[PDB]
Amino acid sequence: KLTSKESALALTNSAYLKNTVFNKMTPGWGCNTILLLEYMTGKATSENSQSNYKDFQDLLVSDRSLYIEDWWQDCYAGIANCNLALQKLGEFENLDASLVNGYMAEVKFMRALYYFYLVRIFGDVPKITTVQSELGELQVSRAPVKEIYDEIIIPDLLEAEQSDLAFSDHTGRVSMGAVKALLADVYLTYAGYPLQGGKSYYAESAKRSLEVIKSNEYTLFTDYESLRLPSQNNKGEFIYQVQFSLNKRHNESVRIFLPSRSGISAYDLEYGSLIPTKEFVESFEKGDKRTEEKQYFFTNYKGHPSKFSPGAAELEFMDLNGYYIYKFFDQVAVDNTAKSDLNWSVYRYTDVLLMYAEAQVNADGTPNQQSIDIVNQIRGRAGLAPFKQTNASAFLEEVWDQRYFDLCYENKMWFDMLRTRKIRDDKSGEYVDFIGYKTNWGKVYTETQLLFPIPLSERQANPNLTQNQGY
Ligand SMILES: [Cl-]
Numbered sequence: 001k002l003t004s005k006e007s008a009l010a011l012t013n014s015a016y017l018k019n020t021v022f023n024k025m026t027p028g029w030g031c032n033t034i035l036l037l038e039y040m041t042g043k044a045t046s047e048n049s050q051s052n053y054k055d056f057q058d059l060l061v062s063d064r065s066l067y068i069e070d071w072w073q074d075c076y077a078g079i080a081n082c083n084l085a086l087q088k089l090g091e092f093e094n095l096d097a098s099l100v101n102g103y104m105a106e107v108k109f110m111r112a113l114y115y116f117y118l119v120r121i122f123g124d125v126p127k128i129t130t131v132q133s134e135l136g137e138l139q140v141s142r143a144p145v146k147e148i149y150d151e152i153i154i155p156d157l158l159e160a161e162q163s164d165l166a167f168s169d170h171t172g173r174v175s176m177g178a179v180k181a182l183l184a185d186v187y188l189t190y191a192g193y194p195l196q197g198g199k200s201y202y203a204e205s206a207k208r209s210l211e212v213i214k215s216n217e218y219t220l221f222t223d224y225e226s227l228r229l230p231s232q233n234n235k236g237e238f239i240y241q242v243q244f245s246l247n248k249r250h251n252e253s254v255r256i257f258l259p260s261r262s263g264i265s266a267y268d269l270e271y272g273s274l275i276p277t278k279e280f281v282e283s284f285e286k287g288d289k290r291t292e293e294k295q296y297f298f299t300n301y302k303g304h305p306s307k308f309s310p311g312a313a314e315l316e317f318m319d320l321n322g323y324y325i326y327k328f329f330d331q332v333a334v335d336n337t338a339k340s341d342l343n344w345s346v347y348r349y350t351d352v353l354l355m356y357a358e359a360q361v362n363a364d365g366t367p368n369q370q371s372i373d374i375v376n377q378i379r380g381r382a383g384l385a386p387f388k389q390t391n392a393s394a395f396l397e398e399v400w401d402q403r404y405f406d407l408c409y410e411n412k413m414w415f416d417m418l419r420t421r422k423i424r425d426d427k428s429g430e431y432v433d434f435i436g437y438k439t440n441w442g443k444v445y446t447e448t449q450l451l452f453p454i455p456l457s458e459r460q461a462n463p464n465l466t467q468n469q470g471y
Contacts, residue, residue, distance in 0.1 A: 008095060029048055372387075
């Protein structure tokens with residue numbers, strides 16, 4: 001005795017459940033799915049021995065490494081939710097078609113989203129759009145990346161794009177802005193590596209990001225504190241986010257960035273699992289607002305009163321003796337409650353603007369005024385003078401620069417590195433080839449590091465899954 005709308009809404013909502021994969025705690029101390037996408041950039045380390053940063057630092061990542069199981073299983077659980085949701089939504093006859101059309105658009109968006117993470121992380125993956133009971137053989141095989149894009153990701157998004165979905169939503173639901181942001185990213189990536197689909201894919205990308213700009217439904221934040229203010233959840237720049245709230249899931253990842261066993265917080269322990277490198281921090285332009293104390297980074301704080309005896313010096317001031325990420329410092333959570341209700345972004349407007357500039361310059365071979373203005377707005381917020389253009393290549397590298405500098409530690413950089421096969425060198429500021437890059441610790445990237453391994457557990461369950469080269 002659910003009404004038709006309640007039943008349809010529940011099916012639609014089931015598609016959101018495995019959004020936990022984009023930021024959730026995993027087995028280990030201070031282990032979280034977000035670490036997989038930060039540990040290979042060479043711009044983060046760990047003070048936490050249990051995070052398995054070592055495998056990543058040593059270039060000894062294997063089918064037994066952390067995170068990869070969580071990413072595979074939860075993305076595929078999400079996809080199973082979506083496939084069943086879409087089958088059942090199609091069987092509603094009496095309920096308003098417009099309402100059902102919207103709901104199915106949300107689910108198709110989600111299926112595309114899960115698969116887009118899967119293909120970027122693991123490469124070829126099983127191509128599953130049917131409910132499990134209607135599959136012919138459950139020992140599936142990995143299908144080519146190109147097929148996942150052409151048969152699942154792109155058609156899902158193109159159909160969602162032609163639906164009745166609202167353009168924006170401030171409560172956390174999928175919106176047309178989310179569809180356009182994802183589809184911009186899909187086409188931009190399709191044009192890059194591995195697929196190298198053709199320049200027209202840059203133009204298809206630029207169309208979508210431009211639609212988001214022209215909508216006037218999103219605005220740039222004027223400062224950086226908004227990225228760590230719970231009151232800004234689902235508003236301002238934010239297009240799609242993982243939802244954290246006091247009455248649902250708390251954002252435990254806040255503790256990941258805090259200096260290990262330091263006592264600066266209300267949490268029982270700070271993890272210190274994601275620490276920026278000194279070399280990355282020192283690579284920002286001189287006078288950048290982002291490197292000012294307690295903008296993106298911090299170097300001192302005070303000991304929390306629950307952690308030190310009254311009159312301890314630590315209560316007045318503590319030098320942390322290094323750079324730490326302050327970008328996500330939910331101050332109420334850290335100082336008082338130990339229950340962060342700060343959302344984690346999947347897409348925000350700054351990313352979409354830089355995706356427009358990148359696609360546009362790649363399609364047209366020369367920046368237009370909109371792209372020039374985007375780079376200067378992002379630079380202006382950082383207290384930097386406007387960018388003096390010299391050529392299309394220098395402009396593309398400046399867009400890349402602002403992606404590194406503005407979007408750092410937001411799970412974007414690793415994906416940028418894979419689609420360009422370029423890594424920004426901290427010392428010289430030059431974009432060097434991924435294959436041949438030497439890290440701070442003497443290790444050299446090869447073709448192997450372009451993908452993560454298929455988890456050993458999945459391969460032992462299903463020996464029809466091949467493995468990525470080198471693993
Ligand atoms: Cl089933």
